[PDB]
Amino acid sequence: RVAAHITGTRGNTLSKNEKALGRKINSWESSGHSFLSNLHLRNGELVIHEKGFYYIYSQTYFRQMVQYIYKYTSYPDPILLMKSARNSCYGLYSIYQGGIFELKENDRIFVSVTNEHLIDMDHEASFFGAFLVG
Structure with a gap:
């Protein structure tokens, strides 16, 4: 079986740039459903x-x-696959998005966000x- 779901571990109050927009998230972890x-x-x-084809979300x-949601292929710069945008009016703005994408052996994918208003790493919220898929 080929599948992965990694959790955002929170230890609340948490734009773009040339190559990749937003700031890359790297605090996930492989006791939190991951x-x-x-x-x-x-x-x-x-x-x-x-x-093969992968439903990334x-x-x-x-x-x-x-x-x-970026993908790093055998090409110098990150390739943006999907983008979910929101604008506020406290606030509650969870954001889910997914989609099928073709990936090759050694392709690296990562999530990027605009910290325009805090991000909560609740293992259940992020x-x-x-x-x-086949």
């Missing part, structure tokens, strides 16, 4: 082992709030994963 099967975690990125709890 696992790794035929995929691993490194530098806060999901490294692909098997080539991410929920970032914000507690211009835009969530990004996760990142993907799985092989």
Whole structure:
């Protein structure tokens, strides 16, 4: 089985730039409902082992709030796959988005966000994963 769901561990009050927009999230972890099967975690990125279509999704709890999902292929710069944007009026702005994407062996994917208004790493409120579809 090829699948992964990694948890955001929180230990609340948490734009863009040339190559990648927002700031990359790397505080996930492989006791919080997160696992790794035929995929691993490194530098806060999901490294692909098997080539195939993958339904990638991410929920970032914000507690211009835009969530990004990049892929690092055999190409110098990060390739943006999906982007979920929101704008506030306290606040509650969870953001879920997913989509099927073709990946090659060694492709690394990561989540990026605009900290426009805090991000809560509740292992239940903020996760990142993907799985092989066929």
